[PDB]
Ligand binder design. Structure first.
Ligand SMILES: *[C@@H]1O[C@H](CO)[C@@H](O[C@@H]2O[C@H](CO)[C@@H](O[C@@H]3O[C@H](CO[C@H]4O[C@H](CO[C@H]5O[C@H](CO)[C@@H](O)[C@H](O)[C@@H]5O)[C@@H](O)[C@H](O[C@H]5O[C@H](CO)[C@@H](O)[C@H](O)[C@@H]5O)[C@@H]4O)[C@@H](O)[C@H](O[C@H]4O[C@H](CO)[C@@H](O)[C@H](O)[C@@H]4O)[C@@H]3O)[C@H](O)[C@H]2NC(C)=O)[C@H](O)[C@H]1NC(C)=O
Ligand SMILES: *[C@@H]1O[C@H](CO)[C@@H](O[C@@H]2O[C@H](CO)[C@@H](O[C@@H]3O[C@H](CO[C@H]4O[C@H](CO)[C@@H](O)[C@H](O[C@H]5O[C@H](CO)[C@@H](O)[C@H](O)[C@@H]5O)[C@@H]4O)[C@@H](O)[C@H](O[C@H]4O[C@H](CO)[C@@H](O)[C@H](O)[C@@H]4O)[C@@H]3O)[C@H](O)[C@H]2NC(C)=O)[C@H](O)[C@H]1NC(C)=O
Lengths: 214, 239, 108
């Protein structure tokens, strides 16, 4: 069972009503009334806010509700408050009796103006190459809300291998930063005309490129 | 209801580990249990489920053959046996209770074999978790490489530069600039664990473009486990 | 007096059993629910059925008693059922002087 699909990020101002979707197949989300949702805050275990798709465990306020249509389930929070900020995961029973989690959503309760990221892509240093290693470093800073999507390309083609990315965290000025790395052999590095770091934030994409011959 | 995991630590790729979870405050023998894991900075991943009596087990495809769940009801203990570990099994591992109870029909509460609970299909109790790090590395100091400012790091009158701190174990390292004289603009990122089982991070600073020809910038890297101290000068590169 | 009879029946749902290596249509594994506390709770139980679309067995045990009239026999059989943890829908056929009590027929 592939992980259930959720948006990476949703946000709203205090008082707003927001919705988070979770999309499965007919053998999990669409095949049962068993969808549940979990809220997780930093350095803590997740806690269930909704189960059996619509039901609230005791202690969870009625600002939380859930619904299901076809293969998609939705969690809704109304009257958004600062304490709702965190990560939300859906989960579903499957036809094989296994369970599966969605990919998770960061919910941001808006506390400041939205800000587009500034992206800087550093090529391998000559010192690093002389050690027979190559690392591309994509630094992403001064953005808000605190979620981005990073994609690497060699020439026009996507690169999934050798990639590591940190989860965004606050800078001292209270906006967010994140970093992504692409690890290559010096030979691999020299085998393309260019490499690109593509950063998507709030639907807008920024792209930075380096070439080995510069 | 309380769940306390243990048995975690750092282990060699390809070796084995047994995690334990001691349950208390509820009737352990009537309830199903899960393991769920979370890699640092990543999402939740379901690992395995086992019925109240241990008569049935289910595992995620990604862990099948390596991780296997079991339980001892006489000890109120849940186990996860981990074999042939991969660097990618690095994560926090949570012991979790499946909510359950009887099924109601015709004025009766119906229970599974041996009066066990039917599953209500959500997790109502979690432990704090235990961390497993899979790495072949022994204590290792970082190599430090400059991320040099250029016109590609430059814009709006300011320029970005930094240093890359590569291939160290275990965490942490600390990074300052000009021995602490440089603060504003400084951000040191969290560490990533590479497939090699070693950590790297970066530290970046944004400075006036006009000062690049004069001002000297030096990142001071410290890694206590290895007693390493490195001072790396970061200089602008010319085209 | 008159001879009255009681058939106490429980319904079982059967599927392919698992014998040594694998599944078999030869042998059937059949589950049903047995009352462990009168009026309160039942729990799952099973049986095997070997004979050399759903598949359902009804396991019946019968007993008789002498009584003057049907009402007396009904009291007697009601108490017998409770005592033995037998609960379900009741019927009476006066022609045959036979009571039946059946558990879990909704399955069929
Ligand atoms: C002896 O007693 C037991 C106990 O009651 C009884 O077991 C039931 O047997 C019947 C008949 O076979 C089962 O009915 C079928 O159930 C199908 C759906 O089951 C899934 O969905 C259930 C409901 O889920 C929602 O509601 C619950 C409760 O509020 C909630 O927990 C859920 O999260 C969700 O919100 C769910 O209960 C059920 O869970 C069982 O299975 C899961 C694994 O999937 C397991 O984890 C649980 O522990 C539990 O065992 C399951 O998830 C339904 O699709 C099916 O429909 C068929 O028949 C109809 C005809 O009317 C057609 O319309 C349809 O096309 C299908 O052909 C059917 O209704 C029932 O599930 C059993 N109940 C339980 C708890 O297991 C036995 O029958 C009794 N045996 C005898 C011989 O009498
Ligand atoms: C027909 O359908 C029924 C119902 O599903 C089948 O009955 C069940 O079959 C399975 C498989 O054979 C059983 O699961 C196994 O259980 C054994 C342990 O069983 C017994 O003996 C043990 C040793 O003495 C004992 O410890 C057990 O005690 C438990 O149960 C009591 C309640 O009686 C409870 O209080 C205790 O806490 C214990 O839970 C028990 O008496 C177990 O050893 C098997 O483990 C194997 O598989 C696991 C993974 O699943 C693996 O980790 C182990 O290494 C080992 O390989 C397995 O769990 C189940 O017990 C049966 N259920 C009932 C109600 O009897 C029946 O088999 C089917 N027959 C046919 C022909 O199809």
């Amino acid at each position: 069972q592939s992980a259930l699909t959720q948006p990476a990020s949703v946000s709203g101002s205090p008082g707003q009503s927001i919705t988070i979707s979770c999309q499965g197949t007919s053998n999990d989300v669409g095949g049962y009334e068993s969808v549940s949702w979990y809220q997780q805050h930093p350095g803590k275990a997740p806690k269930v806010v909704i189960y059996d798709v619509s039901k609230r465990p005791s202690g969870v306020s009625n600002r939380f509700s859930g619904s299901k249509s076809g293969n998609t389930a939705s969690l809704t929070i109304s009257g958004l408050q600062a304490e709702d900020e965190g990560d939300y995961y859906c989960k579903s029973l499957t036809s094989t009796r296994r369970r599966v989690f969605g990919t998770g959503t960061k919910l941001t309760v808006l506390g400041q103006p939205k800000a587009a990221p500034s992206v800087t892509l550093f090529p391998p240093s000559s010192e690093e190459l002389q050690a027979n290693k190559a690392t591309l470093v994509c630094l992403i800073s001064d953005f808000y809300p605190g979620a981005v999507t990073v994609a690497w390309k060699a020439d026009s083609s996507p690169v999934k291998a050798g990639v590591e990315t940190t989860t965004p965290s606050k800078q001292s000025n209270n906006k967010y930063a994140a970093s992504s790395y692409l690890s290559l052999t010096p030979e691999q590095w020299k085998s393309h005309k260019s490499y690109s770091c593509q950063v998507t934030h709030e639907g807008s994409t920024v792209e930075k490129t380096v070439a080995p011959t510069e | 209801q309380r769940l306390v995991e243990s048995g975690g630590g750092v282990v060699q790729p390809g070796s084995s580990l047994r995690l334990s979870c001691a349950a208390s405050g509820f009737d352990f023998s009537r309830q199903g249990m899960h393991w769920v894991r979370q890699a640092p900075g990543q999402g939740l991943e379901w690992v395995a489920f086992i019925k109240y009596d241990g008569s049935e087990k289910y595992h995620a495809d990604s862990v099948w053959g390596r991780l296997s769940i079991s339980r001892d009801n006489s000890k109120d203990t849940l186990y996860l046996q981990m074999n042939s570990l991969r660097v990618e099994d690095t994560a926090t591992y949570f012991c979790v209770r499946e909510a359950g109870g009887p099924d109601y029909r015709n004025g009766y509460n119906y229970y599974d074999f041996y009066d066990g609970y039917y599953n209500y299909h959500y997790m109502d109790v979690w432990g704090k978790g235990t961390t497993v790090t899979v790495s072949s590395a022994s204590t290792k100091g970082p190599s430090v490489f400059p991320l040099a400012p250029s016109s590609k790091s430059t814009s709006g009158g300011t320029a970005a530069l930094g240093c890359l701190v590569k291939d160290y174990f275990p965490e942490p390292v600390t990074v300052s600039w000009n021995s602490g004289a440089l603060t504003s603009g400084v951000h040191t990122f969290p560490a990533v664990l590479q497939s090699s089982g070693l950590y790297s991070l970066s530290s970046v600073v944004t400075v006036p473009s006009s000062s690049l020809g004069t001002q000297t910038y030096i990142c001071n890297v410290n890694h206590k486990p290895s007693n390493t101290k490195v001072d790396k000068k970061v200089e602008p590169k010319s085209c | 007096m008159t001879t009255f009879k009681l058939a106490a029946c429980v319904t079982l749902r059967c599927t392919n059993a698992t014998i040594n290596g694998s599944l078999t249509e030869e042998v059937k594994n059949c589950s049903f629910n047995i009352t462990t506390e009168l009026r309160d709770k039942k729990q799952k139980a099973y049986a095997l059925f070997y004979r050399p679309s759903e598949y359902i067995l009804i396991n019946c045990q019968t007993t008789t008693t002498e009584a003057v009239d049907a009402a007396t026999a009904a009291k007697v059989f009601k108490q017998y059922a409770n005592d033995n943890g037998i609960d379900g829908e009741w019927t009476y056929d006066d022609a045959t002087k036979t009571f039946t009590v059946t558990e879990g027929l909704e399955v069929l």
